[PDB]
């Protein structure tokens, strides 16, 4: 969000949910962020590098949080043969 001088003028660009592309808002205490650990060849996880996801409180309440996480991870290289695109 800009004005004419080309400068941004918001309080903050907010976090969007990853499953649902909807906005997570500030009072949503059911929303969540998931850090998954990047791993070495030696099977050690580095202390400070994460693949992170966002989830709206809506999706966790509705009980789709899991399946959503699955698909997301699987597509982002974490898993394989857990989540099918067909059912």
């Amino acid at each position: 969000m800009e004005n004419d001088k080309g400068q941004l003028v918001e309080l903050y660009v907010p976090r969007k949910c990853s499953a649902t592309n909807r906005i997570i808002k500030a009072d949503d205490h059911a929303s969540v962020q998931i850090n998954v650990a990047k791993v070495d060849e030696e099977g050690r996880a580095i202390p400070g590098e994460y693949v992170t996801y966002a989830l709206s409180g809506y999706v966790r309440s509705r009980g789709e949080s899991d399946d959503s996480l699955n698909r997301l991870a699987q597509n982002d290289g974490l898993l394989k043969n857990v989540w099918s695109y067909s059912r």
Partner: protein, 217 residues
């Protein structure tokens, strides 16, 4: 003085969180009003209403006080709180504590064109509470705040300049009115407008960059 009891409080008192914008971005649940105090220094309260309430406790009749209190920056932050205590100044005190706690951002934007600072709202919003609905509509600049006294105060203390309202229901119950209005401004940051489509990279929580800090002894 003040001793934090929450791993969000020790983060604050150790100046590891500058603005609230970092609380709000990650939705980190506030429970220590002092947080809001330090992060929002220029927060100006306002008792909207004070009401004698008749308690009947085990055949012992007492008189207490219900207080509806609003707080806010005249930039982008509001807060609303209701509290009942045994003494008036006590009620007001506690009320301000509560409203401090439930402080919310606001997306204020433009009407049509795009000059100077954002003056009005970004989109039409609507809050409902009780039987009351309150609807807020973008005005053009200099249209002032078109609302009844209560809702007008709540919006002024939230740095809105120009906004048309439309209410409905028994607006005479000021607590439902205020609550509803509150909801309606508290929805602005929740309406996905096209200028927010661009994908961001997920930020890493203050709670994890400063995790060694503000950890319980």
């Amino acid at each position: 003085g003040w001793v934090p009891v929450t791993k969000l409080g020790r983060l604050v008192k150790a100046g590891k969180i500058t603005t609230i914008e970092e609380i709000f971005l990650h939705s980190l649940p506030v429970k220590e009003f002092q947080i809001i105090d330090t992060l929002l220094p220029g927060l100006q309260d306002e008792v909207m209403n004070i009401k004698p309430v008749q308690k009947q406790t085990r055949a012992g009749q007492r008189t207490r006080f219900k207080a509806v209190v609003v707080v806010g920056d005249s930039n982008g932050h509001v807060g609303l709180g209701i509290k009942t205590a045994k003494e008036v100044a006590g009620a007001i005190r506690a009320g301000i504590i509560i409203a401090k706690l439930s402080v919310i951002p606001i997306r204020r934007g433009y009407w049509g064109t795009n000059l100077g600072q954002p003056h009005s709202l970004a989109t039409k919003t609507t809050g409902k509470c009780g039987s009351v609905t309150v609807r807020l509509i973008p005005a053009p600049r200099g249209s002032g705040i078109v609302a009844s006294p209560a809702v007008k105060k709540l919006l002024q203390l939230a740095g809105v300049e120009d906004v048309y309202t439309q209410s409905n229901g028994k607006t005479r119950t000021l607590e439902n009115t205020l609550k509803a209005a509150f909801v309606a401004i508290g929805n602005t940051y929740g309406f996905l407008t096209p200028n927010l489509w661009a994908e961001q990279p997920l930020p890493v929580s203050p709670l994890d960059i400063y995790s060694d800090e503000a950890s319980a002894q």
